[PDB]
Amino acid sequence: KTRRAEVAGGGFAGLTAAIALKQNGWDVRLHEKSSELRAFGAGIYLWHNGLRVLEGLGALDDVLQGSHTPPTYETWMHNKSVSKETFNGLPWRIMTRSHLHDALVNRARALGVDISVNSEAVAADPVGRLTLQTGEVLEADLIVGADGVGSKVRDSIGFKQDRWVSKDGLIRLIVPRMKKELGHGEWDNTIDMWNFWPRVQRILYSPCNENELYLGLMAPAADPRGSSVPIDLEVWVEMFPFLEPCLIEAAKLKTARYDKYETTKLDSWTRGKVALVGDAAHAMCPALAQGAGCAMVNAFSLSQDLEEGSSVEDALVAWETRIRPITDRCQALSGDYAANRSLSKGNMFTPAALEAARYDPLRRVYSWPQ
Amino acid sequence: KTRRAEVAGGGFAGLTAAIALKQNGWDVRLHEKSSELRAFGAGIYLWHNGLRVLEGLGALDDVLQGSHTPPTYETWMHNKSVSKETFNGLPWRIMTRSHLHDALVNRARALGVDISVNSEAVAADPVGRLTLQTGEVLEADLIVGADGVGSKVRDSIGFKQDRWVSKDGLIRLIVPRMKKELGHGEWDNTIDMWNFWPRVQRILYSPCNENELYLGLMAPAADPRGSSVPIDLEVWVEMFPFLEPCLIEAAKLKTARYDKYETTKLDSWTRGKVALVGDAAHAMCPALAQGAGCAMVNAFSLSQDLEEGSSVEDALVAWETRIRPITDRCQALSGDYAANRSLSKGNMFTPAALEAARYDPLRRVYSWPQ
Amino acid sequence: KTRRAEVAGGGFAGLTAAIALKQNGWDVRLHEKSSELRAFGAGIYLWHNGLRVLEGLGALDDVLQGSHTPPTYETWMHNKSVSKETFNGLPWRIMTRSHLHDALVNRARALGVDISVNSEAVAADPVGRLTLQTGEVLEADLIVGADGVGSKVRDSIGFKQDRWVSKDGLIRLIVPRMKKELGHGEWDNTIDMWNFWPRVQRILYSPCNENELYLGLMAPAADPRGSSVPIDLEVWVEMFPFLEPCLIEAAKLKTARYDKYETTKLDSWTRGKVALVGDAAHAMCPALAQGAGCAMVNAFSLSQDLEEGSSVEDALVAWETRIRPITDRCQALSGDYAANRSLSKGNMFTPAALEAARYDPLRRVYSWPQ
Amino acid sequence: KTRRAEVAGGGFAGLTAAIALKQNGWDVRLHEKSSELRAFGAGIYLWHNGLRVLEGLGALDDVLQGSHTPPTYETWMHNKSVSKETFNGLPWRIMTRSHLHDALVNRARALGVDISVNSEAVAADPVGRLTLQTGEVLEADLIVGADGVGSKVRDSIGFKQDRWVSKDGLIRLIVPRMKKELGHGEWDNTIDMWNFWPRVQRILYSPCNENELYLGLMAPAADPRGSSVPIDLEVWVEMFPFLEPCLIEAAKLKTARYDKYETTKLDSWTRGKVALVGDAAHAMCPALAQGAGCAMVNAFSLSQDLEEGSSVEDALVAWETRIRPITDRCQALSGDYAANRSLSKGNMFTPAALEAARYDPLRRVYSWPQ
Numbered sequence A, B, C, D: 001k002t003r004r005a006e007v008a009g010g011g012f013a014g015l016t017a018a019i020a021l022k023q024n025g026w027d028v029r030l031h032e033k034s035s036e037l038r039a040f041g042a043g044i045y046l047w048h049n050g051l052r053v054l055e056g057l058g059a060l061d062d063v064l065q066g067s068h069t070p071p072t073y074e075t076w077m078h079n080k081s082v083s084k085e086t087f088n089g090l091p092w093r094i095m096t097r098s099h100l101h102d103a104l105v106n107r108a109r110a111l112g113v114d115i116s117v118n119s120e121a122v123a124a125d126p127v128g129r130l131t132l133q134t135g136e137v138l139e140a141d142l143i144v145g146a147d148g149v150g151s152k153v154r155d156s157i158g159f160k161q162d163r164w165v166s167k168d169g170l171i172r173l174i175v176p177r178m179k180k181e182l183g184h185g186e187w188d189n190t191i192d193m194w195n196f197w198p199r200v201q202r203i204l205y206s207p208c209n210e211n212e213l214y215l216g217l218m219a220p221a222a223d224p225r226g227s228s229v230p231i232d233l234e235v236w237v238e239m240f241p242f243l244e245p246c247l248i249e250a251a252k253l254k255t256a257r258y259d260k261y262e263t264t265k266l267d268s269w270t271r272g273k274v275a276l277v278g279d280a281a282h283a284m285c286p287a288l289a290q291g292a293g294c295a296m297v298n299a300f301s302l303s304q305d306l307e308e309g310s311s312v313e314d315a316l317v318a319w320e321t322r323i324r325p326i327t328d329r330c331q332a333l334s335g336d337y338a339a340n341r342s343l344s345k346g347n348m349f350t351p352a353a354l355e356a357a358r359y360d361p362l363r364r365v366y367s368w369p370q
């Protein structure tokens, strides 16, 4: 009859998969383990590739309204501007995580995607059986493992993998823009503010709209003050005095967390009727701001390959073969950028760095040449 | 049988119409009066609306490759920077006219649009008859008058109209970028360089790619030196000394022309099976850089309305009703900006000014909110 | 016995003469027509030449304390910075008129210069007789006519002369610095802010110290709004919006005057025992800011020539021959700068323009080479 | 009869002493150990205090002609401008060492100071006997020990002292300005270019005139590349790429030396008829650029105290009591600035830092208030 998909995970990968499948006439249920649908991480960047996914999902309008494209992506080293990049017109956007989340959830609900909260996938069978923590066993023609770095859809089946959790991380927050209080400057810009002296402290400054500012405060875990939550106001104001008004607001946040970086890589993304998408398959370093971009492109591309009249099993194999190398290359380059601190030099959004961003999943070609 | 369209005019409107119709399965012939297909005017700006038309035409890739999006659209008054605008991420692009022309011609030929040069439409009959200067009479289900401000498709039928040719104009040229020679600055920007003192002289500085620069040199016709062709090098270097390397190259051009501004407005754009598109119907002041944008949106939109299963006559009426107000408003605002010299103030690409640019003809909604 | 000098006028020329003579052992009385000692004109610039006079007068310490040397002398045309000049280290200073006045008066009193207020010289006899408006006739070995452009010491004797009072002028005021309120900029600079468009309005911005700002607001007399006192706040804020906080304070001043420019030139500066100094002899255009500088150098130089053991009559002739050409050249060049609006171009403090400033009256050589 | 002075040392202290004494009618001979009169160290800064000494010596004109006052004293940290200081008009000047040397030598010769080269003082007797390495014993009313950090006039007598030679130092050179090749910037400025990351390397950039640039390249002795002579071009270009044209010229200099810092401090500067001046008495860290300034003020002040009608012995005691505290304070503060790297912060030419510079030795008061 009507093809049935069960999607595990209510993040950006899972919502993208669910919407894309529902648009193509699948009956879709999405399962979120948490008690409510929420997106963590404060803010997020999307690029052309991700914006094209949103267009394909019919969720672009709600995203662009109330989000921001900075006039330029600027990099500082020790308070000296070292580069300003605009990517030869390649579209990009900054927004709060909740803003993107809301657009996707609203679109899924409008389409009639069934959503279950407090519903955790704990086992998946490649023949198309999904077991929830409740003991309910669902039969489906497709099972999507969009359940994050700790994917149980993945681990119940067994996928050869390398995972890494870093010792280091960052504190991500949303604070008021305080634009007037920042005084003279280019405060609508993205500004990646690097320092190695007198200490290793960095802030990625990311306006989301006229009201909200996304800050990432990065210091090594071995730095007891820089890695402290709620933030140690003094050590941040000392090295970023021009952001004092915003940092004062940041210091009020008792919910602040020092989140560590984490990566996953698998030899394969499929097993029978099961496809792994997003961080379940390819969590990467955030240097190129493509973790969700690739997750969304991959989820959308999955729906495309399922429209070819092949068996689900064959479509899934074809899907990975077609789409995975863009992600493998992006993940590898992101990890290398992170390790070499490449972004600190500025002008590092090269044609190769922008490969993932340049991909248009709708037409399946690369656009916005560099 | 197969629906037949005859298109008069090989400009951007005519090529857009021809491609769009051919993609929808029309048999299409395009007639260009001139001995060869060529686009005059040196350079051109397109925005989101026009870029979306190109996407819809399958001609976007060839356009983006080898064209330019400046990091910002900057305005100067008396050499003082008064604004820098990036339109909240709204896509835009600068290119040579030949670059856009070539992309459209190549796409039309790839699709099998028949093209006749030295073929001038001199009379059109609303019942679907087109007479060429050769005396050949063609029967068609649709006749597109894309034959410019002096449209004979229009005037052979008789459309109530207001036309205006200004006394004033400008000299448009392509010269080498000479980027190194320009020294320190932001020479990838669009820079609209206004002056009223010591004389009324203005240059719109518009990089097209890494090799080619589009310059518009604007001075009143009453100024014998500023309006002179080939350019009077001294009076331009005097007020724009920072562009001397480029102006020296400009002064070599014996083909330079002082072209006067011209507008057309009609009470109606249709008569039976005849539709008027582009400058034939709505030539406007270039302040908002939307003359071709609107022409292309209108031509593309025409093809859309012809896919509704209506008679051609009814589709044409529906087309104008649907699409004309965007153009009427843009034309009116452009004319008002020109007359009031509004752009000289900077920060004048307001939400209202950007209305046409914001329109997405593919989805028929407004995007890129301001 | 002790040589007796009577000095007419309590301006900078008269006070300089009185101090310089008293230091050399003259008995000196100074006569000021006005009811009190006061200096009008809001603020004033001095340069190396004038500062050296102050040193020679023992009045330099009180002047430098509480006055200002800007980091640079900056010129704007239509809000674009066209030059920044620092004169190769040549000393200069800005102060309120009252500040300079007070230093000179205090020094004169410390030395025992007799000062009479409400004492107007109405006739001077070259044999050494001075008649006051009171009818008192004083005998002296030297009479100094330091009584301004309308000198009665001069006109009672009869000196061939050319005088000119311009139709145009300016409004000079002292207002609070409002430095914080001016926001980002270089607000300790001298900034000469020229415009010809949209109207002829100019402000010379001249900080005097951390508290007081000297403004000169210049517009043609034919401009009813720009030349209005108290100032027409709107027309000044319109063209100088960045000075709004200071202009708001300026608009409160009910004492503001539109003062017209005035020049004097004489074929000779001496007659018997009478010497004319300052505006009585050589009032000039203020372009080079040397009116008082030359007056002070000339007054000081007069005292020098009187130490040569010559008759007073011979010393006076020698004095004019020695010192007058520096003033003649400065006056001529200042007038030419004013008429040609030369300062509007920036970088016009050339070696020739700075000749007067470069003169050291103490050592009688030119210093601070350019 | 005529008072006789013998001066040991042909540096700035010795020449200043010799000129000042000769002007007051002393018979003066100066003894320089080296085979010729020469000044080492590439370039030098003087301030108001030193410029006033030059005025008092009649050597100011030859110094100002062909030397430079930068528009501002600028400080960079990691290529970010952190301060621009102009010292509220306090006069200052940069020149090559040879330029200052030549002015002083020419003045000494014009006055008839006797100069002996290859003449080394090896012993001084407080009763007024000077023994040269030749075995010649000279009798004098005054012996000036201006013979540098290794003063034998000092050490032959025995003065309790603390001396320190640092392990660290710098490479001082004169190179062509290469102003055009430096491109856009403020290349007439003094720019103190600090870095601690990626390595400790600093350049003090000091224009001397339109032709000559004084560079100080500072790196720790423990850095084998940064401290290398002739300069290791690559490691300097890497951290100061904007100076590449000048550094290329610097790398040609086979005479370049890595000179270590050195200080001296004594409990007393006098013994009978012997006075110690300059580095013989008070060599200091160069942070405040006052080593020669203080030497010159002290030498000039010595001549002043010898005009009081006291015995030479009493005049010398009075001299030290009067003048030494300015030097003690300057030396102490300079050393503290050096150790704390205070100048790296910018805005450190405070009123206290500028105390020595503010002293006017001619009038014996402090001028140019801050």
Ligand SMILES: Cc1cc2nc3c(=O)[nH]c(=O)nc-3n(C[C@H](O)[C@H](O)[C@H](O)COP(=O)(O)OP(=O)(O)OC[C@H]3O[C@@H](n4cnc5c(N)ncnc54)[C@H](O)[C@@H]3O)c2cc1C
Pocket (backbone or CB within 6 Å): A008, A009, A010, A011, A012, A013, A014, A031, A032, A033, A034, A041, A043, A044, A045, A046, A119, A120, A121, A122, A146, A147, A148, A149, A150, A151, A152, A153, A170, A261, A262, A277, A278, A279, A280, A283, A284, A286, A289, A290, A291, A292, A293, A294, A295
């Ligand atoms: C610091 C940082 C900055 C980043 N910045 C960007 C950026 O700017 N742009 C960008 O594109 N990407 C960015 N990323 C990466 C991006 O956050 C992720 O790649 C993306 O959120 C992955 O989404 P997902 O849906 O695969 O997984 P997740 O977001 O982890 O979502 C899975 C959802 O899984 C639910 N769940 C888990 N287990 C189960 C289960 N067993 N059953 C049912 N539900 C389950 C999880 O609770 C959750 O609701 C960044 C990442 C980090 C760490």
Ligand SMILES: Cc1cc2nc3c(=O)[nH]c(=O)nc-3n(C[C@H](O)[C@H](O)[C@H](O)COP(=O)(O)OP(=O)(O)OC[C@H]3O[C@@H](n4cnc5c(N)ncnc54)[C@H](O)[C@@H]3O)c2cc1C
Pocket (backbone or CB within 6 Å): B008, B009, B010, B011, B012, B013, B014, B031, B032, B033, B034, B041, B043, B044, B045, B046, B119, B120, B121, B122, B146, B147, B148, B149, B150, B151, B152, B153, B170, B261, B262, B277, B278, B279, B280, B283, B284, B286, B289, B290, B291, B292, B293, B294, B295
């Ligand atoms: C100075 C200036 C700057 C501009 N800048 C921009 C800009 O930046 N961006 C933008 O979008 N627009 C811009 N425009 C407007 C843009 O140039 C026009 O709106 C656009 O080129 C109109 O195209 P069209 O096809 O309608 O007409 P045309 O370009 O005039 O083309 C019609 C073609 O008609 C052929 N022809 C004429 N008569 C016949 C006939 N009887 N039979 C067959 N063929 C015929 C003409 O020869 C020609 O080949 C600008 C205009 C001006 C004047």
Ligand SMILES: Cc1cc2nc3c(=O)[nH]c(=O)nc-3n(C[C@H](O)[C@H](O)[C@H](O)COP(=O)(O)OP(=O)(O)OC[C@H]3O[C@@H](n4cnc5c(N)ncnc54)[C@H](O)[C@@H]3O)c2cc1C
Pocket (backbone or CB within 6 Å): C008, C009, C010, C011, C012, C013, C014, C031, C032, C033, C034, C041, C043, C044, C045, C046, C119, C120, C121, C122, C146, C147, C148, C149, C150, C151, C152, C153, C170, C261, C262, C277, C278, C279, C280, C283, C284, C286, C289, C290, C291, C292, C293, C294, C295
């Ligand atoms: C707009 C403007 C800006 C200027 N800016 C500068 C500047 O920046 N730097 C600079 O150096 N110069 C400047 N000047 C010029 C400077 O103001 C004059 O040259 C200077 O004040 C002349 O001084 P004085 O003593 O000769 O005459 P005055 O200042 O006119 O003084 C004479 C004194 O004469 C008293 N008096 C008059 N008649 C008699 C009498 N019969 N008997 C007794 N007393 C009498 C007058 O009342 C008064 O008290 C400027 C001038 C103008 C107009």
Ligand SMILES: Cc1cc2nc3c(=O)[nH]c(=O)nc-3n(C[C@H](O)[C@H](O)[C@H](O)COP(=O)(O)OP(=O)(O)OC[C@H]3O[C@@H](n4cnc5c(N)ncnc54)[C@H](O)[C@@H]3O)c2cc1C
Pocket (backbone or CB within 6 Å): D008, D009, D010, D011, D012, D013, D014, D031, D032, D033, D034, D041, D043, D044, D045, D046, D119, D120, D121, D122, D146, D147, D148, D149, D150, D151, D152, D153, D170, D261, D262, D277, D278, D279, D280, D283, D284, D286, D289, D290, D291, D292, D293, D294, D295
């Ligand atoms: C890196 C550096 C930068 C500096 N920058 C500045 C600056 O910008 N401004 C400033 O004011 N100061 C500066 N100084 C300090 C300044 O260089 C010295 O304080 C000054 O040159 C000391 O001069 P002097 O005459 O006392 O001694 P010296 O310059 O050492 O001269 C004494 C002369 O002594 C001769 N001599 C030695 N022994 C005998 C003898 N026994 N008999 C006869 N002759 C003898 C020496 O050969 C020489 O000719 C700087 C110093 C250093 C190290």
